[PDB]
Amino acid sequence: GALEERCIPIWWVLVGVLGGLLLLTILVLAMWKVGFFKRNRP
């Protein structure tokens, strides 16, 4: 009844975005290196 006390404080939303995106980068690079995506066909 003042600070509704955000159920979504700005930091945590912001932090989760960076971690999820960083994880995507590592996965994309790994797939590319294995040629998984170069594998278009043998």
Partner: protein, 43 residues
């Protein structure tokens, strides 16, 4: 919800990180899937 009118911070944080994975993986999954079919589909 019923006290944590504010969902647990860790839960929210984890959920966002998971959503990012789904968003990033969908475009890639569609691409990967289409190649597999063009590649696997025996002509």
């Amino acid at each position: 919800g019923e006290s944590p009118k504010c969902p647990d911070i860790l839960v929210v944080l984890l959920s966002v990180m998971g959503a990012i994975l789904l968003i990033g993986l969908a475009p890639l999954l569609i691409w990967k899937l289409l190649i597999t079919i063009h590649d696997r589909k025996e002509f």
